[PDB]
Amino acid sequence: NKKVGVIFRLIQLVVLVYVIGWVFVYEKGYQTSSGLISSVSVKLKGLAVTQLQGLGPQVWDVADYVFPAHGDSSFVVMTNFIMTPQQAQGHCAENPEGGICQDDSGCTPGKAERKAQGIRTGNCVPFNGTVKTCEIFGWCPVEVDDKIPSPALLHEAENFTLFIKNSISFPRFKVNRRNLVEEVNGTYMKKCLYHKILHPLCPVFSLGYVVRESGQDFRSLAEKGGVVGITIDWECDLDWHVRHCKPIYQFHGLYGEKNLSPGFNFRFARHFVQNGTNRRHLFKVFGIRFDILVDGKAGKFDIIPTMTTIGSGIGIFGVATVLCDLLLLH
Amino acid sequence: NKKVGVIFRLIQLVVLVYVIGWVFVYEKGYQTSSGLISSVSVKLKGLAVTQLQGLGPQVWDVADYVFPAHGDSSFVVMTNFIMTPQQAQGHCAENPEGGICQDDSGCTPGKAERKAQGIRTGNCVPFNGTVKTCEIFGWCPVEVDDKIPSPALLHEAENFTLFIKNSISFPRFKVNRRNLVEEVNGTYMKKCLYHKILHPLCPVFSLGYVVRESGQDFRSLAEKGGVVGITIDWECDLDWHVRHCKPIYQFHGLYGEKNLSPGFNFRFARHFVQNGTNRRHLFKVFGIRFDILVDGKAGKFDIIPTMTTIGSGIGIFGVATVLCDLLLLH
Amino acid sequence: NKKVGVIFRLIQLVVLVYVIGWVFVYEKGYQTSSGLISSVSVKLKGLAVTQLQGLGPQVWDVADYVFPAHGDSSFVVMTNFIMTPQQAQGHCAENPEGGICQDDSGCTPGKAERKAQGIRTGNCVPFNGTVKTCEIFGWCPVEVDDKIPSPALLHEAENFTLFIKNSISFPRFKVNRRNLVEEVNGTYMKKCLYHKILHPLCPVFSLGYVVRESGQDFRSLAEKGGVVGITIDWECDLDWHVRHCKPIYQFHGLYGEKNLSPGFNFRFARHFVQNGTNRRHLFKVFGIRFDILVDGKAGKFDIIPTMTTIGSGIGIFGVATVLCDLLLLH
Ligand SMILES: Nc1ncnc2c1ncn2[C@@H]1O[C@H](COP(=O)(O)OP(=O)(O)OP(=O)(O)O)[C@@H](O)[C@H]1O
Ligand SMILES: Nc1ncnc2c1ncn2[C@@H]1O[C@H](COP(=O)(O)OP(=O)(O)OP(=O)(O)O)[C@@H](O)[C@H]1O
Ligand SMILES: Nc1ncnc2c1ncn2[C@@H]1O[C@H](COP(=O)(O)OP(=O)(O)OP(=O)(O)O)[C@@H](O)[C@H]1O
Ligand SMILES: *[C@@H]1O[C@H](CO)[C@@H](O)[C@H](O)[C@H]1NC(C)=O
Ligand SMILES: *[C@@H]1O[C@H](CO)[C@@H](O)[C@H](O)[C@H]1NC(C)=O
Ligand SMILES: *[C@@H]1O[C@H](CO)[C@@H](O)[C@H](O)[C@H]1NC(C)=O
Ligand SMILES: *[C@@H]1O[C@H](CO)[C@@H](O)[C@H](O)[C@H]1NC(C)=O
Ligand SMILES: *[C@@H]1O[C@H](CO)[C@@H](O)[C@H](O)[C@H]1NC(C)=O
Ligand SMILES: *[C@@H]1O[C@H](CO)[C@@H](O)[C@H](O)[C@H]1NC(C)=O
Ligand SMILES: *[C@@H]1O[C@H](CO)[C@@H](O)[C@H](O)[C@H]1NC(C)=O
Ligand SMILES: *[C@@H]1O[C@H](CO)[C@@H](O)[C@H](O)[C@H]1NC(C)=O
Ligand SMILES: *[C@@H]1O[C@H](CO)[C@@H](O)[C@H](O)[C@H]1NC(C)=O
Ligand SMILES: [Ca+2]
Ligand SMILES: [Ca+2]
Ligand SMILES: [Mg+2]
Ligand SMILES: [Mg+2]
Ligand SMILES: [Mg+2]
């Protein structure tokens, strides 16, 4: 039948056009993918002043709210903290959430199995006017995290400037690229803010804009901390000029249930010596966690991948033809 | 022939059952796999008190033995250290391991090529009553690391509590998951310890339990140092409910030959100003290295992967039947 | 025809030799591959004395130029810094790059929108004899970055010794290997220096050698900063003995356009209490960024990969071999 032959030739032309176009153009068959070596260098620039009751104006600069100072990809930006200054290793009443005692016989000398707050001496001392806690030996007085100020202390850190410097290089092709491209110049970085449509190549990111693009409100996040994931994609074609290689930034919001362990927090201490007595300042920082992930590939024309793709296409063509013949003969 | 037809039908039925089951159900071909964005947040609640010979009791809390304060996945838990306090830059005898001099003419002014402890002045000063070392200009007193206490100073850190907060999200499917599952509640995290059979979902990990599950003794690993690798496999299936998706924790141990470079150690110093003189406290911490690596895949039904798997199965069936027929023909 | 059959037999034996040798040996089809768990431990031994103008001799050791104290794959080695001592919060003039004012009416009370150095009170104070800058509320004095010392301060850090301790383990094969191979002994590491041909197994890496092998000059990387990427490869075959497994160290140079943001730099502060007043020392460190990336796989004989390769070879032989029949027809 002529119609059977027409259908066979149509299927043959379809599969041939497919194997000659799709894998070659969309899948980049004539090209070869290769990994890159990425080193993330982040740099912020902003000032936040937090005024607390009983303490003077606290000045916080880039070195203060950015705890990883060596330029690590994973860094935390301080937004809310609880200040517990002038801690000494001495006897004090333990935190009330650890345990409540009504008499000295209730306390047991030793160390707590879970949430150890100090070396219990077996004495029940009054923590305050109402409740009493077992005396412990440790840094004192114990930090009380119970109260969380609803307004963020470092609320000025919402619209800060975040500069991410990423340099990637492909060892196979020996091509080194950086986030700073030929389109971006010195005067451009001085007056640009990152945007998905307006300024896609501007390396200066706004913290509030980054948090809002991920799908999270900055105020509720900074109130108790959080995690924001930033990804940089370096998908490009080496067949064109190096100016076409431009990094693409995607922001992903990492959030969980607020009923169980809401936000992200941690504690750090600054050890100093004053009046011959070693003292420290403990801060429970509720800050946003920023993680930079870089994943990209580069493809250039090569003989061996092209030949392998041609062979695979010829094989698929033959398989399709023999299968069509088998289906037609029934 | 009837037997040849029976054999061919058996072969085609076998390969059909194969392409139906093994490709779809076993390999999840109809589903679509994507990567996740992982962020690691770790917390340790526990106190360790170390009393040195001739020194007062020293209190070490979460801010002390956890050196990464921001909460990086790679963190070291202090278990044994050597304290050399009151170091100020000065001209003094070098460590005897660097060099031994019998007269002043042996020392040469300059800097050592390898393991340089200071700028040699060219004078041979007695380090102690027996041996003499060349005078250098560096921090003094030179830390002597030869004597490591067999009993671990922070031996109480074996049965501490480690909480790992892992939040992963898939961008293509827009699904966010956290290590805290619906099965785990607030009262469950109060009193639970992670176990391979009893409590697999309890986010509270015991350091000694993690070390013993990897195959290492905590005492020997703490007295000299070591590395423990923790991996979180987020096997997630979007076809079912999100409650069935669950994280799986695997504990691995990284160890080497004890004769060459036993354990893991590092050196850090705390700079302070006392009596108008810049002084520091150097510590050679022998701590266990913990690394968190999260890798997971999610699968959701989709039309295009299903069609591709059906086409691949049809092709495999066709090729197999043709091959079988060729073999039968012989 | 005889020649047609000869050509057919030749093509068949060629594709048979291909499917029996290439996928088996060149691709290691019978072997199975899996990921490893790697932890990077770096430790440097070197001392450099920087005699800054106006200050006494400053001694720098491993606890000084290595900013990651615990130890991470990404670490910075200090080569040049700008010291601003005795910083205290107060009301002082700002930098001229932020803003220049000729009268008190020019300054506006509030905080700068971009590159906010300090809270501007609103009064124009003379920064020096020539120019005047708006008075701010921040750390006093202000760091100046217009003058960069051309001679490297830590120029002695060029030929320091870098030791990398990497422990890899394959959970699929339960084999643990370390960079310290059996060929390397204790006395070997005392005098060896890493080289591409001379000492490939020596774990003592020279900083200048690493910088020069990547393709970058150490002088520019010390003056303005730089980034160097080091990759460790663990490609090995488990069919042989474990002594044949040797780590491969490759150095990559990550550089960008010197006209826009040359090198890598950061700022960190050391908080201390002197005379009852909180003070700090801010350093703009121009250091080289070293990133360690470990990627490797191990191969061991197994029955299932061998059977899959046999089936794939049979399939290819069937497909390719039946193919060209339309061509026999001519
Ligand atoms: N966080 C940021 N906010 C705004 N602009 C930035 C930020 N980081 C870098 N830039 C801009 O990028 C350019 C290149 O930065 P570079 O690496 O030279 O920093 P730098 O000039 O050494 O830092 P400093 O200005 O403290 O000396 C600078 O001109 C600067 O204006
Ligand atoms: N290392 C740990 N050991 C035991 N329990 C922990 C640990 N980390 C967290 N938890 C428990 O998990 C719950 C949620 O933790 P969350 O993130 O709220 O810490 P937190 O309450 O801010 O810390 P803190 O209790 O020190 O203020 C808490 O109720 C706490 O009891
Ligand atoms: N950065 C380095 N430069 C030169 N030699 C090193 C370096 N790191 C380690 N080594 C050598 O490797 C051997 C094993 O090192 P090990 O892990 O015992 O360090 P360590 O002796 O604890 O450190 P320290 O010498 O500071 O006490 C040592 O004999 C040392 O000479
Ligand atoms: C004493 O401390 C406890 C701790 O929970 C608190 O509930 C109580 O209100 C305090 N009492 C006073 C008078 O401050
Ligand atoms: C938002 O950005 C502006 C800069 O134009 C700044 O003045 C303002 O303080 C920012 N908002 C907050 C809440 O910090
Ligand atoms: C700076 O970069 C921008 C990119 O948006 C470009 O439009 C502009 O022309 C550049 N300026 C100069 C002076 O080249
Ligand atoms: C002096 O120091 C050396 C260092 O190796 C030691 O061997 C020796 O015993 C010491 N002598 C005394 C008397 O302490
Ligand atoms: C083991 O855990 C218990 C808690 O039940 C604790 O009291 C004990 O000190 C731990 N052991 C060590 C060696 O720390
Ligand atoms: C807490 O979680 C555990 C999970 O093991 C569950 O058995 C228990 O019922 C939960 N408690 C409440 C009050 O829901
Ligand atoms: C004052 O500071 C400015 C800062 O740019 C500088 O250019 C100028 O030379 C300085 N004047 C004197 C007299 O130091
Ligand atoms: C180069 O290495 C030698 C060691 O033989 C050392 O003496 C010299 O100071 C090094 N060069 C620099 C610039 O540090
Ligand atoms: C030390 O290791 C080197 C490796 O190059 C080897 O040649 C030498 O024989 C070893 N020394 C001893 C005493 O085994
Ligand atoms: Ca101090
Ligand atoms: Ca890291
Ligand atoms: Mg609490
Ligand atoms: Mg030693
Ligand atoms: Mg500047």
Are A131 and A144 in contact, with CB atoms under 8 Å apart?
no
Length of chain C: 330
Of A25, A29, A72, A63, nearest in space to A44 by CA: A63
Instruction: List the structure tokens of B109.
Output: 């002014």
| Beta-carbon contacts of residue B45 (< 8 Å; ≥ 6 apart) | A114, A115, A116, B62, B160, B161, B163
Q: Which residues contact C145 (CB under 8 A, 6 or more apart)?
A: C82, C284
Distance of CA A52 to the CA centre of its chain: 30
* Chains contacting A (3+ CB pairs below 8 angstroms): B, C
Distance (Å, rounded) from C-alpha C252 to C-alpha A146? 50
Residue A234 lies in a domain: yes
Same domain, A9 and A73: no
Same-domain status, A185 and A48: yes
A222 Cβ contact partners less than 8 Å away, ≥ 6 residues apart: A79, A80, A152, A154, A155, A157, A158, A286, A287, A288
Q: Could you tell me if residue A111 is inside a domain?
A: no
What is the residue-wise DSSP string for B76-112?
EEEEE--EEEEEEEEEEEPPTTT---SSTTT--SEE-
Q: What is the DSSP letter of A60?
A: E
Question: Of the residues B131, B133, B142, which should be mutated to test ligand 7's pocket, given the most ligand atoms within 8 Å of the CB?
Answer: B131
Measured between alpha carbons, how far is C302 from C298 in angstroms, rounded to an integer? 13
Token look-up 């103008």 returns: C53
Domain-located, residue B152:
no
* Residue in A75, A138, A254 closest to B47 by CB: A138
Q: How many domains does chain C have?
A: 3
Q: Count CA within 13 A, CB hemisphere, residue A54.
A: 3
Residues B56 and B165 occupy one common structural domain: yes
How is residue A117 written in tokens?
């707050």
Which of B37, B165, B272 minimises the CB distance to A252?
Answer: B37
Residue listed under structure tokens 């110049």: A185
Q: Is there a single domain that holds both residue C67 and residue C207?
A: yes
Kindly give the number of the ligand 6 atom that is closest to the alpha carbon of A183. 4
Distance from C-alpha of A156 to C-alpha of A46, rounded to nearest angstrom: 8
Return phi, psi of residue A246, to 5°: -130, 135
**What interhelical angle do C303-322 and A303-329 show, nearest 10?**
70
**CA-nearest residue of chain B to A258?**
B180
**Residue at A315 is within a domain:** yes
To 10 degrees, the CA torsion angle through B68, B69, B72, B75?
A: 30
Which of C51, C70, C323 is the best residue to mutate to test the B interface, defined by the most B CB atoms within 10 Å of its own CB? C70
Residues C64 and C26 in one domain: no
Across the interface, of C37, C178, C319, the residue whose CB is closest to B319 is C319
Closest approach of A321 to chain C, Cα-based (Å):
10
- Closest residue by Cα to residue C149 from C77, C92, C79: C79
Give the amino acid at A254.
Answer: L
Among B112, B144, B176, identify where a domain stops. Answer: B144
Q: What whole-number distance in Å separates Cα of residue B318 and Cα of residue A314?
A: 17
Binding pocket residue ranges, ligand 12, CB within 6 Å: C 183-185, 187-188
Please choose, from the candidates B17, B126, C233, B139, the residue with its C-alpha nearest in 3D space to the C-alpha of residue A35: C233
Residues C173, C238 contacting (CB under 8 angstroms): yes
B64 and B183, same domain (yes or no): yes
CB B83 within 8 A of CB B284: no
Verify that C90 and C73 share a domain, yes or no. no
CA gap B66, B71 in Å, rounded: 9
Examine the domain organization and report whether B256 and B291 are in the same domain.
yes
Tokens 């990990």 sit at which residue?
Answer: B205
Question: Does the beta carbon of B183 lie inside 6 Å of ligand 9?
Answer: yes
Contacts (Cβ under 8 Å, ≥6 apart) of B120? B94, B107, B108, B109, B110, B111, B112, B134, B135, B136
Ligand 1 binding pocket includes A45 (Cβ within 6 Å):
yes
* Residue to substitute from C34, C39, C190, C325, interface B, most B β-carbons within 10 A: C39
Write the DSSP symbol of residue A127: S
Extended beta strands in A46-184, E state:
48-50, 58-60, 75-93, 119-126, 132-140, 161-170, 175-178
Residue A280 DSSP SS3: strand
As given in the structure block, the two tokens for residue A123 are 């004495």
User: Does residue B238 contact residue B175 with C-beta atoms inside 8 Å?
Assistant: yes
B86 burial via Cβ count (<10 Å: 0-12, 13-18, 19+)? exposed
What are the phi and psi torsion angles at B5 (to 5°)?
-65, -40
CA of B272 to the centre of ligand 13 (A): 4
Binary contact (A256, B167; C-beta < 8 A):
yes
A314, amino acid identity: I
Please check whether residue A204 is in contact with residue A180, taking contact to mean a CB–CB distance below 8 angstroms: no
- Listed in sequence order, the DSSP H helices in chain A are 2-21, 62-65, 186-190, 207-214, 218-224, 303-329
Of C122, C147, C172, which residue sits at a domain end? C147
Mention every residue, 6+ apart, whose C-beta is less than 8 A from residue C198: none
What is the number of alpha carbons within 13 Å of residue C161 lying toward its C-beta? 18
Query: Does the annotation place C1 within a ligand binding site?
Result: no
Task: State the DSSP string of B204-253.
Answer: EEEHHHHHHHHT--HHHHHHH-EEEEEEEEEEEESSS-TTT---EEEEEE
Greatest CA separation for chain B: 105
CATH of the domain at B10: 1.10.287.940
* C225: alpha, beta or left? (left if phi > 0; alpha if psi -120 to 50): left
Q: What is the DSSP string of C282-305?
A: EEEEEEEEEEEEEE--EEEE-HHH
Question: CA–CA separation, B286 vs B301, rounded Å?
Answer: 50
Which are the contacts of C209, defined by CB distance < 8 A and separation ≥ 6? C159, C193, C194, C195
Which SS3 state, helix, strand or coil, does residue C176 take? strand
Alpha-carbon gap: C185 to the closest alpha carbon of chain A (Å):
32
Ligand 8: atom nearest CA of A110 is 7
User: How close, in Å, is residue B246 to chain C by CA atoms?
Assistant: 21
Taking Cα atoms as reference points, which of A246, A280, A284, A281 lies closest to residue A267? A284
| Dist CA A130 CA A142 (whole Å) | 17
Tell me whether residue A99 is in a domain: no
Distance CA B261, CA B227 (A): 13
Q: Are residues C68 and C197 in the same domain?
A: yes
**Distance from C-alpha of C232 to C-alpha of C210, rounded to nearest angstrom:** 13
Torsion of CA B140, B141, B147, B148, to 10 degrees: -60
Mutate to test the interface with B, among C40, C45, C61, C245 (most CBs of B within 10 A): C61
Residues whose CB falls within 8 Å of the CB of residue B83, separated by 6 or more in sequence, listed in order: B52, B55, B281, B283
Helix axes A303-329, B303-329, angle to 10 degrees: 70
Q: How far is CA B42 from CA A116, A275, B255, B290, B291, in A?
A: 17, 35, 23, 10, 11
Q: Whose structure tokens read 């979460």?
A: B62
Burial class (CB in 10 A: 0-12, 13-18, 19+), B262: middle
Cβ atoms of A233 and A247 within 8 Å: the answer is yes
Binding residues of B: 43, 45, 115, 161, 261, 265, 267, 284
**Minimal CA–CA distance to B261: which of A78, C260, C311, C204?**
C204
d(CA B30, CA B19): 12
Give the C-alpha separation, C102 to C106, whole Å: 7
C312: number of Cβ within 10 Å? 13
- Does C61 fall in a domain? yes
Q: How far apart are CA C56 and CA C53, in angstroms?
A: 8
Comparing CA positions, the residue from C15, C8, C17, C315 lying closest to residue B324 is C315
- What residues make up the domain containing B216? 33-82+157-300
SS3 C311: helix
Token digits of residue C75: 């670490």
Tell me the C-alpha distance between C136 and C119, whole Å: 5
The two structure tokens encoding residue A15: 């599969």
> What's chain B's Rg over C-alpha atoms?
31
Which ligand has its closest atom nearest to the C-alpha of B115? 3
In a domain, C154, yes or no: no
Contact across the interface for A89 and B59, Cβ inside 8 Å: yes
Residue C254 token pair: 């990550």
Distance of CA B304 to the CA centre of its chain: 39
Measured in Å, how far apart are chain A's first and last C-alpha atoms?
Answer: 14
> Residue B268 in contact with residue B67, Cβ under 8 Å?
yes
Residues within 6 Å of ligand 5 by CB: A 155-156, 158-159; C 113
DSSP per-residue letters across A165-204: EEEEEETTTTEEEESS-SS--HHHHHS----SSS-SS--E
Residue A10 lies in a domain: yes
Tokens 């290819």, residue located: C316
Identify whether residues B281 and B183 lie together within a single domain. yes
Question: Could you tell me the two tokens for C186?
Answer: 């204790």
**CATH number assigned to the domain comprising residue B189:** 2.60.490.10
Q: What type of residue is C132?
A: K
Nearest CA to CA, how far is C161 from chain B (Å)? 7
* Alpha carbon separation from C214 to A61, B160, C226, C234, C295 (Å, rounded): 35, 44, 11, 20, 19
Tokens of A218: 């900055």
| Closest by CA position to A60, among listed A154, A175, A172, A126 | A154
The verdict on B122 and B215 lying in the same domain is no
Question: Which of C98, C116, C147 marks a domain boundary?
Answer: C147
Q: Which residue has the tokens 């890899």?
A: C168
Breakpoints of chain A, after residues (C–N > 2.5 Å): none
- Does C251 lie in the same domain as C227? yes
Q: Show contacts of B18-25: CB within 8 Å, 24+ apart.
A: B18/B316, B19/B312, B19/B313, B19/B314, B19/B316, B19/B317, B20/B313, B23/B309, B23/B312, B23/B313, B24/B309
**Beta-carbon separation of A37 and C319 below 8 A:** no
CA trace torsion B114, B119, B120, B121 (10° rounding): 170
CA gap B82, B92 in Å, rounded: 20
3-state secondary structure C87-116: EEEEEEECCCCCCCCCCCCCCCCECCCCCC
- The ligand 2 atom nearest the CA atom of A97: 25
Chains A and B: how many Cβ contacts under 8 Å? 121
Ligand 9 pocket, residue B195 CB under 6 Å? no
- Rounded to whole angstroms, the Cα distance separating C107 from C135 reads 8
User: Which of A70, A169, A171 has its CB closest to that of C67?
Assistant: A70
